[PDB]
Design a protein around this ligand. Structure first.
Ligand code: NA
Ligand code: NA
Lengths: 396, 401
């Protein structure tokens, strides 16, 4: 196919062994209780006891449970009353919370320097099988912003002095979509002649959601986000389809893409850097707003691909970003989807939690590695805005 | 021309009256002196007078001078009408309070980053209402460019929602620093070419909105020399412009800058010479005195290549080109000019924009391009060059039509 871009070769890197959810919940609950006691001058044991019981009750009620998420990769959760060891200065940098003295923990500068170090290493592992520089490298993240970025430093470390680096930043849980949109555009811009020809764009996701741990705030939506979000680093490539074929690779051919905002929703999800970490609010209104608009969005997306929702939806897999425990279910229900059309997305959430932008790429990795050639996949995700983003893919 | 994207309709928006360089120098030196005394719990009078003479000498030696920058828009600097002379500063009007982020009476770190981001959201949300007040039809894409405030949802996404623009794709082009317009334009170009590929329906217009509020990052608590330079070099700039497929631009009968080529990559061994990282209180900068030499040493090969990408030849055609060069510091344009064997007239607008406005981060190149579109003879080709953290060199070749 001329004028075609193809996703391929998806490579996750695990930086830390995933922690069983019931343990994340016990310790996070204990940390929120100590922080709270530090924050309100409660100093006596029986004081901590009553606060701890209340925090635990709150966790039982509102925390994402082990039945919903089995384990999460959390680089900044301590390595396996609790007592926490100090770590080797060998790595004070993994320790960004504080339950003895200042409950706000590390400040943002410290967290940013930590991010650069951890992602730096992650990126060197993500790209160690890469033999030739890409024409472009896109860095996607919503969890740490530095200039130059860890991506820029790695490209230089590799001596990749003809590679364009583009930051695709602050586009949250759906950040794969705009990154794939750029990549498609960089291949199309090359075919238009504005740059010499290009044969590969590499996109690298690095989300350290656990770097933004906030145990000083006890509002429900913070309990929920502390127990919901997880870390994920994953890279994949975008090839012009002729280059994909020449290299004998399997891939996901891009058919169509779409993205725009949803009305009366801007305040329902926010994410803002403050003095110590990026701070989140999340309204319980969000799944209903997604439910309300997803169908019309999906019908339009399939039309963009020359498809018809009523006639073609049954043969499609739907890769859906699992933003909360019930998001896939809601979309499943609104779109009238069978279990086997949404099974991979539920399972990635169940095994990993919400790794923010890195989630959808892990979903697409499983489709690329499991589906028959010819399979079509409609991808949907949501993030702040609120934004709806979508992609139509075909396995080739 | 098919497969052709063209820049047009450059629209700056001034939010505050620019302040003459000399007064920014004197008040800023005064702030640095007070902040130093506060950090150090120096409450002694003569203690302050000595700190202050010292601070002023460092300003005399290192600050960007009124001969280099005449005035700057600094939304987060007090209005002259508020300056009373030591100086004091009048309390702001109530609905202007979010414009005071520095503190020289109690805690010299000033407002924390969250307060700064909230102030930024408001000031940019008003700036964007002005920038888009004459927009008649929603664009297909809106690209928000900044390296100076990051919120989700952004002020750009909120504006797009307030307008009811629910078909418009919003993309954030963030944290690409002073050369920010170059990745923005590359992205606009890809979107049109992606539409032409058939991956979205046809599009007719991408809008790019730069909102750089560098003054929101005032740091008067560090007196290291490179921060004296930064606090007196950088300035604020809000500007939008549009990218059209050429056939659309012709039907509207607009003049524009047709894009011929573009490039961007990193320069070796220079990652630590210019850095920009959010911390507790603001985004913190560092800047190495080596930056101008590193740029000069690489800019010729880059420029030769860029011209090659446009089907031209540096050595044969440079005399016919204008060179829009991001003025990152007082001497950047001069160093590049010298390295490239350029005449004064080929680089005058980049120099003039610097002198009149300071370094407006990513907004600076778009103001230089607005002047070219207004003044250039049809057929004139412009080589554009921008640098920023990486270090990164970014390139564009344009033709006025
Ligand atoms: Na870049
Ligand atoms: Na967006």
């Amino acid at each position: 196919h001329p004028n075609s871009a193809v996703l391929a070769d998806f490579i996750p890197v695990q930086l830390a062994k995933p922690v069983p959810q019931r343990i994340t919940l016990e310790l996070t609950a204990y940390g929120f209780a100590r922080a709270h006691c530090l924050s309100n001058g409660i100093t006596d044991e029986e004081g901590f006891v009553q606060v701890y019981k209340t925090v635990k009750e709150k966790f039982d009620k509102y925390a994402v449970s082990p039945a919903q998420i089995k384990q999460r990769q959390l680089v900044y959760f301590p390595k396996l009353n609790f007592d926490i060891a100090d770590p080797e200065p060998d790595q004070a940098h993994l320790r960004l919370f504080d339950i003895k003295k200042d409950p706000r923990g590390a400040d943002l500068k410290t967290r940013h320097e930590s991010y650069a170090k951890v992602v730096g290493k992650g990126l060197e592992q993500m790209f160690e099988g890469t033999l030739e520089a890409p024409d472009d490298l896109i860095h996607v993240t919503c969890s740490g912003y530095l200039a130059p970025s860890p991506a820029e430093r790695m490209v230089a470390d590799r001596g990749w002095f003809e590679t364009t680096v583009t930051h695709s930043y602050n586009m949250g849980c759906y950040g794969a979509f705009p990154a794939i949109k750029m990549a498609h555009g960089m291949l199309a811009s090359a075919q238009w002649g504005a740059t010499p020809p290009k044969t590969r764009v590499d996109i690298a996701h690095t989300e350290l959601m656990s770097a933004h741990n906030n145990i000083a705030e006890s509002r429900v939506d913070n309990i929920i986000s502390a127990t919901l979000f997880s870390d994920g680093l994953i890279k994949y490539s975008v090839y012009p389809e002729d280059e994909l074929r020449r290299q004998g690779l399997r891939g996901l051919r891009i058919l169509a893409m779409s993205e725009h905002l949803l009305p009366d929703s801007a305040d329902t999800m926010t994410w803002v850097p403050g003095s110590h970490q990026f701070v989140m609010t999340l309204s319980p209104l969000v799944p209903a707003i997604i439910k309300r608009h997803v169908r019309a969005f999906a019908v339009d997306l399939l039309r963009r691909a020359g498809m018809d929702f009523e006639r073609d939806k049954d043969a499609l897999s739907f890769a859906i970003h699992p933003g909360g425990p019930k998001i896939v279910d809601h979309v499943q229900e609104e779109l009238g989807l069978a279990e086997d059309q949404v099974a991979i997305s539920k399972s990635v959430f169940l095994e990993n939690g919400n790794m923010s932008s890195s989630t959808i790429p892990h979903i697409l990795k499983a489709y690329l590695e499991e589906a028959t050639v010819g399979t079509r996949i409609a991808c949907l995700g949501f993030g702040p805005g609120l934004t709806a983003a979508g992609l139509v893919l075909e396995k080739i």
